[PDB]
Structures are given as C-alpha cells and as structure tokens.
RNA sequence: AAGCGAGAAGAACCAGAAGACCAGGC
C-alpha cells in the first residue's frame, strides 16, 4: 500500500545530484560527500580507503536511514591536502585495484583451466 | 478453498510442515495442512530494528516467497423483488438513467452486472451493477462496491439462486499480500513480534558459510519470557536439518534433553549450544559475540498492517449528531 | 449479451441472458461461474 | 533527408488547393483533344467530374 | 528604459502551451 | 476524460512494461491502477500507451 | 477527524521527538495553511499538484 | 502448497530436487541420504526439502472449473 | 598513500562453485566484493508474464512468481542487453528483453508436470538452467485433465538490488582469519569450536595467539552460482560492475568539483 | 552554463532569456538538443552563423532543449523561484543552473578607458 | 497517542518525518512513557490544524519538555534493552575502539565539534576506549555520581574506593565518564541519572541530542559487537548442577 | 543575422441504517 518501488534502491527518482559536496564548517579541511542511491557496499570501500591515505585525517561513512537510499562520507584532511583530492585519489586506487584483482582473476581462471 | 466462498480467507504459499514436530501433530493433522515456515531465525541485536519485541525479516527470501500469502474476500449480493413498487435487478449502470451512480467507473462490470474473474479492482471500484426501480429517473443505483482500500484482483464469480428463487452471485475477490513492515509474525512460544524493517541477503549477517538468517529476534525477548523452549526448538532443529529427520519435541520425553540435542549438533560440525560466528553483512567484520543461530518454525498472524492503517480528514459523519462515522 | 457461464457439476458452456432463472441447460446444476475475462492480465514476476 | 522532405511534402500536400494547378500553361485537355490553358482543362475537368 | 539594441532571430518560443 | 477507464501501457521509465488502468487523467499526469502490484501510481501522459 | 492509526515499528534513527509517517496517511491528512507572500509560491505549486 | 523454486535462505533451486526426493524415499534411501545425494549440504536447503508438505497433489483430486 | 597489490589464488573450479582466495586485500573490499557477488551482477531472469489462461489450481500471481524465481542461462548475452528502463524502445525487442513462452493443456489422465522444459524461448543462448544440456527441470505447476496454462513472458537484465530473482549466487561462503589470531571473535571456551576448513593448527591447539599487528588478510570465498552465470563468470562481473560503478561515481565527482572550481 | 538567473516580466519574456542563455553557453546538450530540419547553409550553400541559426531553431521550439537540459534540485531561495521545463514556477527543481528573480533586477554607463598601441582596452 | 491513557505522557507531540512503509515508526526510548511494544501495538495520530494549537503543542507538550515527569520527580524515559545492554558492554574497562571504529561512531555522532580526542593508548597503536567515547556523547560538563548494579557494598568502606577494581561507582566528572560501567542506573529513568542530571543542568533539546546520540553510536558499536541469546547462556557446569541437585535434595 | 504563396472558432457543457450478538488486537 506503501511499499516504495524495489528500483527506487539504485534509480535516482529524477533531477537528483547523484553526488553533492558540502564544505564542513566544524573544522578545517574537511567535507560531506552525500551520495545518493548508495550504500555500504561504497561505502565501506571508500572510507578504508581514505583511511589507507596518511594525509587523511578524518575518513567515516555513514547511512542516515535504511529506509532512505543516501550516504554521508566525512573527510578531513591536512591543510596541503583537500577532500575532494582525497575522495578523488582514493576512487583513482579503488579502481586500479579492481582491474588489478580482475586481471589476476583472470589470469588464475585460465591456469585453473589448463592445469 | 478454492471452492469454498467464505467472506475471510487467508492461504499461505508455501506452507511447511515443522521440523521439530510433536507427536500429538500426527493426530491434529497439522503435517498435512501445516500454518507457518521453518525460518533460519538468528537471536541478535542487529541495527536494534527487532528490539521491544519485534523482528527483523530477510528482503531475499520475501522476494523468493517466504511468508507471501493471498487474502480472499467474498462479497454476496441478490436481487429482491421485494414488491412492485421498486424491484432490484443486476445490470451495468448507466449515466442516463441510473440517478445515485458514485463517480467511480462502472466500465469493469459486464452487460450482466457482475465484473468479470481476473480483473483488476481497487478500492471503492464497483463489482455489483445493482439497479432499484423507483416509485437520473425511475431508477437508483445500488450496486455493491469493493471495501474501502482494499486492491484485489477478482479471484471467481459464482451465480446461482437463493432459497427465494432470485438471484445471488457471490463474487471472491484475491490479495496478494507480501510480508512487509508491520506484519506480525510469531514462533510457537508467545514469542510474537512485528517486522521492524526487512535487509536484503547482502546487508544481513552470514555464517563461514552463505547462511543469512531468514528472521532476526532480538535476545532481550527470551529472558523475560523464559522462552526456552523457543530456544530448544532452534537447536533440535538445528539438529533435525542437518540430519535429515523431525525433531521431536513431545512434552514430556526423558529421551531428548538438550544434552543429547547439543551432542547431536556437535557431530555435524557447529558449536553444540547452537551458536555460530556470524559476519557483519554491512563491513564484513566478525561480530565478536558469537550469534546463536538455527531453524524455528514461525508463523504468520492475520494481522497485518494494510488491514489496520487508517486516516481521516473531514470524512463522512453520523446523522443523529454531526461527528465523525466509526471505524476504518 | 450471450453471457456465457461455466457450470459447476458439469463445467458446460452455456448462454444465459439476463431475466433467465440459472440452471444448466445440460444438466440441471444452479450454480453457474462466470469464464475469465478478455482483458489484458499481466503480472511482473516478483 | 528523406523524413524532412516526406513532413515538408505533408504539409504541402495538406494545405494545396485545386487552384494551384490553374499554374502552368497549354494543358492537354481530355475532354477536348488538344491543349488548353491550365485554368481552362482544369475547369472542363471539373465539370465533367461533377456531371 | 530596458531596450535591446538588434534582436536576431525569429523569437518565441513553442515550448509555453 | 476520454483516457479514463481504458487499459494503458507504461512505455518509458522505471515502471516501463506495467499494464495498468487509468483511474484520473490529466493534461499531463495520468494516474494508472496498476495490474501487477497493488497500488496506484502517477505518471506522465507521454509514457502511456493506450492498449486496444 | 485529523487522525489516524495504524500499528507502530521500532526507528533508532529517529530522534526521540520524531515519528515515522507513511506517505498515504501523510497524503490523507491535511493542514490548512494560510497563505502569505512568504510561502504563496510553494503553496501554489502544491495547489498546481 | 508446491515445492518453491529457490531456497528462501540462500537461493539455491530446490523445485527441481522435489521428484528426484520423493524417489529416492522410493527408493529406500533415508532423507538424510537423500538430501546428500542431491547435493543439500547446508541445513536451508535441507530444512527446504524435508519441511515441504505437497498440497498441490490433493488440490488435483478436485474436478476443475473448465473441462 | 596508494592501491594495494592483491593476489588471488582458486583453490576449486567446477561448473556448480568455485573456491578461491584473495591476499593482500583489505576487509572493505572483499565484503564489498562478496556483496557484488550478491546484489550487484545483473542476469537474465522471467520479469513479466501475460496469462493468456490459467485453468490451474494456482492463481496468476503464484505463476508469475514461480516463473521469476526460474533461473535462466545469462553467460554471455547479458553484456549485451541493456536494460529495460534504458532501453528506447516499445514494450521489448531482443536488445533488452528474451521473450518466452507457455502453452501446456492436460488431455491425459495423468497428472501434467509443467516444468521449466516447456519455456519455449525466442533467444537460443538464454534458457533455463536445467534446459542447458543430471539435474532435473524445474517445476512451474501440476495439471489435472482438462486444465489448461498459457502464458507469455518477457526476460529482463537486473540484479540482486532489484529483486531476488536477479541473485546468480546460491550462496557466498565469506571467510577470513579461520585460526583466531585478530581475535575480530571472543569465544568464551574456544576448545569448544570447531576448526573451520581453511584452518591451520595442530588438533591439540584451539585458536593461535593473538596478533596484535595483524590485519584482516587472505579472504576465503566460496561463490556457488545458480545456475546463471558460470562460477567464475559471476567473479568477473563483479569485479567489473564494481569498477564501473566507481568510475561512474568519479564521473559525477569529477562534474561535482568543476562544477565549483 | 554555470549560473543564469533571469528577471523576465513575462513567462515569454523569461523563456526566451532562457533559452538565448542556453544557447550562449554552447553546452553540448543545447547542440545535441537540434532535432528536425535545420540547415547551416543557405540555398546559395553559404555557411551560415552557426549561433544565429540555433537561436532561430530553439525560439521556433524549445520542447526538446528543456527536455534535454537537466533539473538541478533547488532549495528555498528567497526570491529567486526556480523554472521548470513547462515553463510553470517550481520551488524544490528547476533547470540546471536556472533561478528566476522577482526582484526585477535591471550597465549603460559609458567607462573611459585607455587603449594602447597594440588596440588592447584597459579600464 | 496510546489508549489506554494513563498519564500525561502517555500523548506527546512529535515531529513528521515521512518514511516509506506503512507503520508509525517511533524512537526506541520514547516507548516507554507510552508503554509501548512493538508486539503489534496500534497508536493513534491526532494533526492539529492551526497555528495556535502547533505551537501550544510545541511549547507543552513536545518529547523533550516531556522527559522528566512530576509524578515522581525523574525520567519517565531512558535508555532501554538493545543500546542500555551495549552501553553497559561498551563503557567496560576492557573496550578498546580502533582508529576505523572510532571514526565510524563519531560519525554518529550528531553533537561532534568534529575534533577527534587524543586516543587514551598512544603506544604502540593508538586505542581509544569505550568511556572515552562515551564522555564525547556526554553533553555540557555535567557532573555525576552513580554505582554500577554490581558494586559490592564493601568497596566504599575499604581501600581502592576512589579506585574501583571491578571499575564500578560510576564518576563523570566535567562531561567525561572518568570511570564506571553505566547501566540501568545511570541510563534509567531513576532519579539523579545521568539523563535527569542532563535535563536539569542542560536544556530538554540538549538532552533530546543526548538520547538521539547514546541510541546511534551504541547501536553501531553494537552491530560492531554483537549481542546474542542461547542454550549456551541457560547451561551451567556440572559442577553447579550437582551443587543445586543436593541443595534441593 | 536570416528572409521566396493562405487561417480562428456556429450551437452549448449523494448518500446515513440502527440495534443486538459473537470473535479478536491492544
Ligand atoms: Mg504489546
Ligand atoms: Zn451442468
Ligand atoms: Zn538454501
Ligand atoms: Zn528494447
């Protein structure tokens, strides 16, 4: 009667940022990146990830709500640094390790396959 | 059931027979018509979306039927030819000369006056095009419209005559209704409780192996209770699953204690008290307090939430005094 | 305005049209169901 | 092309009349043998038809 | 006041229904 | 409204392929009954696709 | 009337001074808003709607 | 009523195991046996199996609406 | 300041499962990866069906469902459609859907069967599982003499997230630190567990000691498909819709810093 | 198009600032946004101004540059109103990069400025 | 609203946050003035309909105006089951939160300056603990003494009283949970609580943002930890076995 | 800057039970 439709999960409703960045006023160096349509399956990886960066000092994720389909990614930084450099290296490895791991992936399926 | 026209109908899909049975159940042949599903439940506190006594249900197996059920509802209604002043017959409604016709369409009915199996109909559409001669002209709508909130699809429809020799159709109206929040749900030990919320099989914990529990209950509802043999139960049929046989939990059986059950779950290769190392579904980590996990046999109680949700706002009121009707 | 209903003893397909008592033309049952519509019923497989 | 062209010749198609063809000079004209003016084959034509 | 200086173009717009 | 009652189809956007039935019908938003699922829904006019 | 009922669910992520209101009792119910310069454009875009 | 398709747990199809089972009882195997020999090693599959009460074999006994 | 170098060894490769392991990976991203596994690899699955009759003792709905949950062969040509929401075109068409269908009627006396063999496909490369040239074939309905079922289904692209149907995996047996080292776990009499399958201690031993340098390493997967994909196949789609879905997400990053540099 | 808010006194008048605005961003939607017959050169095969020549196609319609534009969530600015494609005021959307004001914000003056020997104008 | 209605508690207004499925979805700490279940309770919802009746309603009869009740001069609401279970875990001696884990809970923490405290262990990896966390969920700089449900009454008499070994009598000193395991106790709604020192010496918004945040990051910590029930916990060694077979012989 | 045939609107347009009893949730 109620049940929300099963795409509203990963299907943006319509006119949605899938990604919006808000400058955190608490401290310095520091931003939300509320990404919508999201859920721990980003952002665990993007939090360990900045997490592994020694210039990040702050790195947590949150979902505000089961229910709604949102997430808020906390990064604080050293003064060189910036978040949104953060957010974006920590992508930049997230994805050069997944072609690395689905190049070895391959590599071990076609020698499992031989012999 | 399916020939019986009864005005309240609930059936479950895919009922089971319970793993850890009694052996009075032979006799009260619940094997054969069994009213609930073996659940792998899991006794956790996870996202305290089950605490004060509620349940956190797994989105996957809704979505693979577990729990799904089909309300039907049956409305009757007959012609009466009561007296020639006014007589009332089935027929599809007209604008023209129809006078008190709703504004909901009369196009889903058929020339006859009764819609049709297979339709889809929804709250306050028609289902019975009933017509009263009078003594917009020499004619008033009567006919009978589906339940306040109701969307159902027309499961039958069955014509025949009353004792009176006029006619009487009976029209049985299906609901699929799937387990969602607010639904109550219970074990066979009072142990009854609400759906707080439902996490797919990717967000629910997991054992070393792809074992997410069906059902989470939260923990602090044993203590108080002393449900234990809800507890039992879990590990029996524990035991029964992964031995391929019934558990049976007779009353009074000196036979099988919860050593022996802890025994026989030992051999298969889990902790003997039922315990399991369950991952967390969001992160992946262990959780460090080691869940106790294993099939119970839960139930599906009639009271669900599409049933109960009501609103208001300057509705319909009584006619003696000007204050709002009573009930939904 | 056939009106073709389904026996329920017999399961014959006989015409009634409307101001006609029910009973099956072919065997006598009264209680007649009506046959499923011709609409569209479709149903996505969740 | 070929879609504008076919919506373009539509629209001219729609909105011609008959008149458009009293353009053009020494028309055949059927009902005479020999060549007309445009208006004139067009008009005999017209006759012819409505009788 | 608000003038424009040359205004090319046919103007409008059919998108306001 | 000549829309309403008849059966229409969703040929755009997320609910694309659901048969449904057109309770209200506007200028722009039709509000379709739909077959498979129990609810009603409000979508856009040019998605629809009258069936039959 | 402005009431309504239906059977409660636990919410940690709601603050103590907040409920959770389904859409379709939210959409039954209503309050008459005034309308001032203030909000007469949100209120006519939900009167448009 | 009929055997699901999938196990509600984990996902794996049990309505093709539902025949090759009842042949195996047949068959004088043990369910446990027979819930091996299939292939349902985890107690979901097996719990989906050995719980199944097949109603559908009675609702058949009933003459239907259309002949 | 950078990637990791993980490696990655398959211990067991059959056409029903296969067992690998992955080294030098942090925690994040093999549960993120086991979640892919489970939600995130789109497949080929029954997601809209046209009753033309149905005579049988099941309603509508049961059938439709029944004929989701029927898994169907998706190895190669799911790359290839898209889905159905993007695609332009009307109702189908054999870039974003596989039509089906059903035409069965009981004229024996004996029970029908109507199994996953009767859905005829318009598409060769996709078709039931148990149609794939063992294990039987799925079981839609039973019919009596004189009941009839006949339908028309559409198949679609789409995954966990949206439905369940969608989840190629029969279960992902997700495992790190068998041996307790990092103690992620406290058991309160550890003689009292068994050893898992991936551990590595003599029998008199419990659990090793705890490693307080240690991080979670050398993630154990058992990735057992449905049917759908091939074992392996499901890994590697993973792997490359998690990718693509960053690199979507660095996109919208991307757009979101230019949009105030 | 970073950001356009527009005064108009009319919706016609605020649709074609709009729309002259989008076109003056040269975004690769406004240019992907041409459907129909549109011809860059004239009969005489003579290249036309590119510019000029979608200012006449999007004022002839604009359906589908709207359409094809984007909405942009909006909160609530005061007095500045977001524009939906349908050309009706929306509070909570409005087209990427779109406010309308009602402020009727409304340059002329004429600033002497130096030029040097190479015709480049400094204030 | 709940019927039957008790007390003046019992109907409290509340703010509407639309959510998706068909339930009223209420804070957990909230149900016990209403002496709420979720076993399937019903709860009325009346909407006033003018702006006099909103604001009498937002300025008498709000949840946080409600927390303390004259009846008997204390909370009437508290912290309960799932998060007064972890917090009583969570703010043992013996918790220690990696640096990912704290950052995680501050991230649920709705009342965070952003800053993150120095960690108690610096060496040889940075740790912070349970109570550390716990004094940053603790709002202003209240000042508390309670005795944790296990604090044996000799200990106040003998040495170590200032120094609990079993790290009971509970001590927040300046905001800061010095030392203590909080319980029922200190969470409850018994008089001289934390929560009631909270709504006294901070405002009833203060206190809201108290509950809000104790609920959260214990919820997380919890999900983190784990909380169970089993035959495990109802089995006693043989030894006790035989000690209660001769006693009751 | 573009620039190669024409338009505008006759007539008129919703429903109440109520009462009793039983089962049931809270
Ligand atoms: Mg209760
Ligand atoms: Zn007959
Ligand atoms: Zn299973
Ligand atoms: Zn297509």
């Known amino acids: 009667m109620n049940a929300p439709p099963a795409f509203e999960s990963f299907l943006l409703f319509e006119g949605e940022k899938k990604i919006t960045i808000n400058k955190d006023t608490k401290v310095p160096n520091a931003c939300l990146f509320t990404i919508n349509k999201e859920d721990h399956t980003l952002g665990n990886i993007i939090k360990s990830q900045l997490l592994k960066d020694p210039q990040v000092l702050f790195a947590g994720y949150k979902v505000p709500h089961p229910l709604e389909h949102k997430i808020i990614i906390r990064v604080q930084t050293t003064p060189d640094y910036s978040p949104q450099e953060a957010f974006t290296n920590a992508i930049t490895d997230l994805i050069s390790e997944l072609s690395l791991l689905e190049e070895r992936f391959r590599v071990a399926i076609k020698d499992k396959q031989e012999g | 059931f399916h020939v019986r026209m009864d005005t309240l109908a609930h059936v479950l899909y895919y009922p089971q027979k319970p793993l850890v049975t009694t052996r009075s159940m032979e006799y009260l042949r619940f094997r054969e018509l069994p009213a609930g599903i073996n659940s792998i439940v899991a006794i956790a506190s996870y996202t305290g979306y089950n605490q004060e006594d509620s349940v956190i249900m797994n989105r996957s197996a809704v979505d693979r039927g577990f729990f799904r059920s089909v309300f039907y509802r049956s409305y009757k209604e007959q012609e009466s030819k009561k007296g020639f002043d006014q007589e009332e017959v089935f027929e599809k409604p007209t604008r023209e000369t129809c006078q008190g016709m709703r504004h909901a369409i009369y196009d889903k009915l058929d020339d006859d006056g009764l819609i049709a199996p297979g339709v889809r109909v929804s709250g306050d559409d028609v289902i019975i095009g009933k017509t009263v001669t009078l003594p917009r002209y020499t004619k008033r709508d009567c006919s009978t419209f589906l339940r306040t909130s109701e969307t159902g699809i027309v499961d039958q429809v069955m014509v025949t005559l009353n004792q009176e020799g006029y006619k009487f159709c009976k029209i049985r109206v299906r609901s699929v209704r799937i387990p969602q929040i607010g639904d109550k749900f219970a074990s066979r030990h009072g142990q009854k409780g609400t759906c707080g919320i439902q996490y797919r099989q990717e967000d629910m914990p997991f054992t070393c192996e792809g074992i997410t529990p069906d059902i989470i209950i939260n923990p602090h509802a044993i203590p108080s209770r002393m449900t234990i043999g809800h507890l039992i139960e879990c590990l029996q049929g524990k035991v029964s699953a992964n031995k391929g046989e019934i558990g049976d939990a007779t009353p009074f059986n000196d036979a099988v204690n919860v050593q022996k059950i802890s025994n026989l779950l030992s051999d298969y290769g889990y902790h003997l008290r039922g315990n399991e190392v369950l991952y967390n579904g969001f992160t992946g980590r262990k959780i460090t307090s080691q869940i106790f996990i294993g099939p119970t046999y839960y139930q599906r109680l009639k009271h669900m939430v599409d049933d109960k949700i009501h609103s208001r706002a300057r509705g319909p009121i009584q006619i003696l005094n000007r204050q709002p009707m009573e009930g939904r | 305005q056939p009106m073709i209903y389904i026996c329920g003893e017999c399961h014959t397909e006989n015409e009634i049209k409307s101001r006609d008592p029910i009973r099956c033309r072919e065997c006598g049952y009264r209680i007649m169901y009506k046959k499923r519509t011709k609409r569209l019923v479709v149903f996505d497989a969740r | ?51 | 006041a608000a003038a424009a200086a040359f205004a090319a173009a046919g103007a409008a717009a059919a998108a306001a229904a | 409204n000549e829309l309403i009652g008849q059966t229409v189809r969703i040929s755009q956007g997320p609910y694309k392929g659901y048969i449904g039935v057109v309770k209200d019908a506007t200028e722009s938003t039709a509000r379709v009954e739909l077959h498979s699922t129990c609810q009603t829904i409000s979508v856009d006019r040019q998605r629809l696709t009258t069936v039959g | 009337d402005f009431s309504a009922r239906t059977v409660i669910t636990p919410d940690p992520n709601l603050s103590i001074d907040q409920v959770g209101v389904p859409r379709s009792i939210a959409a039954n119910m209503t309050f008459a808003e005034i309308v001032t310069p203030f909000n007469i454009d949100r209120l006519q875009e939900l009167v448009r709607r | 009523m009929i055997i699901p398709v999938r196990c509600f747990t984990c996902g794996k199809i049990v309505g093709n195991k539902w025949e090759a089972y009842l042949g195996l009882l047949q068959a004088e195997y043990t369910e446990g046996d027979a819930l091996d020999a299939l292939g349902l090693k985890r107690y979901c599959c097996r719990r989906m199996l050995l719980a199944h009460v097949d109603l559908i074999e009675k609702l058949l006994n009933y003459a239907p609406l259309e002949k | 300041p950078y990637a990791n170098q993980p490696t990655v060894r398959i211990t067991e490769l059959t056409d029903e499962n296969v067992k690998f392991i992955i080294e030098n990976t942090d925690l994040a991203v093999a549960n993120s990866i086991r979640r892919v596994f489970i939600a995130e690899v789109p497949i080929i699955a029954i997601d809209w069906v046209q009753i033309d009759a149905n005579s049988s003792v099941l309603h509508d709905e049961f059938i439709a469902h029944r004929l989701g949950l029927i898994p169907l062969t998706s190895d190669d040509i799911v790359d290839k459609l898209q889905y159905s929401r993007d695609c332009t075109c009307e109702e189908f068409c054999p870039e974003c859907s596989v039509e089906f269908t059903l035409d069965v009627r009981c004229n024996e006396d004996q029970t029908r069967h109507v199994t996953s063999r009767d859905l005829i496909s318009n598409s060769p490369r996709v078709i039931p599982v148990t149609s794939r040239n063992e294990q039987d074939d799925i079981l839609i309905v039973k019919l009596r003499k004189g009941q009839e079922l006949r339908l028309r289904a559409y198949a679609k692209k789409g995954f966990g997230k949206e439905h369940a149907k969608w989840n190629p995996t029969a279960g992902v047996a997700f495992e790190y630190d068998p041996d307790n080292a990092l103690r992620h776990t406290v058991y309160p009499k550890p003689e009292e567990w068994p050893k898992s399958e991936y551990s590595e201690l003599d029998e008199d031993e419990s659990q090793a000691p705890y490693d307080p340098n240690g991080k979670p390493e050398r993630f154990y997967y058992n990735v057992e498909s449905c049917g759908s994909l091939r074992p392996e196949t499901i890994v590697l789609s993973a792997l490359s819709g998690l990718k693509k879905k960053l690199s979507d997400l660095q996109t919208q990053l991307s757009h979101e810093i230019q949009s105030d540099v | 198009l970073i950001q356009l808010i527009v005064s108009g006194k009319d919706e016609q008048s605020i649709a074609e600032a709009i729309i002259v605005a989008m076109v003056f961003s040269q975004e690769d939607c406004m240019i992907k946004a041409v459907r129909g017959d549109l011809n860059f050169v004239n009969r005489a095969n003579q290249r036309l101004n590119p510019m000029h020549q979608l200012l006449r196609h999007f004022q002839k319609d604009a359906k589908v540059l709207f359409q094809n534009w984007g909405i942009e969530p909006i909160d609530n600015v005061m007095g500045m109103i977001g524009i939906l494609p349908d050309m009706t005021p929306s509070t909570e959307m409005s087209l990427r990069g779109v406010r309308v004001s009602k402020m009727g914000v409304d340059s002329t003056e004429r600033v002497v400025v130096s030029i040097d020997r190479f015709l480049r104008v400094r204030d | 609203n709940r019927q039957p209605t008790l007390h003046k508690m019992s109907m409290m207004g509340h703010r509407v946050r639309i959510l998706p499925w068909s339930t009223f979805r209420l804070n957990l700490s909230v149900t016990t003035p209403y002496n709420a279940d979720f076993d399937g309770d019903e709860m009325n919802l009346h909407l006033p309909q003018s702006l006099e009746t909103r604001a009498e309603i937002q300025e008498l009869a709000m949840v946080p105006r409600m927390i303390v009740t004259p009846q008997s001069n204390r909370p009437v609401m508290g912290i309960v089951q799932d998060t007064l279970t972890a917090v009583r875990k969570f703010t043992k001696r013996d918790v220690f939160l990696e640096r990912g884990e704290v950052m995680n809970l501050l991230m649920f923490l709705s009342t965070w300056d952003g800053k993150v405290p120095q960690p108690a262990i610096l060496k040889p990896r940075p740790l912070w603990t349970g109570k550390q966390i716990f004094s940053l969920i603790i709002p202003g700089h209240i000042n508390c003494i309670r005795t944790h449900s296990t604090h044996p009454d000799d200990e106040d008499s003998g040495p170590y009283k200032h120094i609990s070994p079993g790290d009971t009598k509970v001590v927040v000193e300046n905001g800061e949970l010095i030392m203590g395991i909080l319980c029922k106790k200190s969470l409850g709604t018994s008089a001289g609580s934390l929560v009631h020192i909270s709504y006294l010496e901070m405002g009833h918004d203060i206190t809201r943002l108290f509950y809000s945040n104790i609920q959260t990051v214990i919820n997380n910590w919890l999900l983190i930890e784990g909380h169970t029930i089993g035959i495990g916990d109802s089995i006693a060694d043989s030894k006790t076995y035989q000690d209660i077979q001769n006693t009751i012989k």
């Open chain 4, 1 to 51: 092309i070929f879609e504008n062209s076919c919506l373009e010749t539509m629209e001219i198609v729609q909105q011609t009349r008959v008149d458009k063809l009293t353009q053009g000079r020494q028309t055949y004209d059927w009902t005479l043998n020999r060549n007309q003016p445009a208006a004139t084959a067009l008009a005999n034509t017209i006759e012819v038809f409505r009788s």
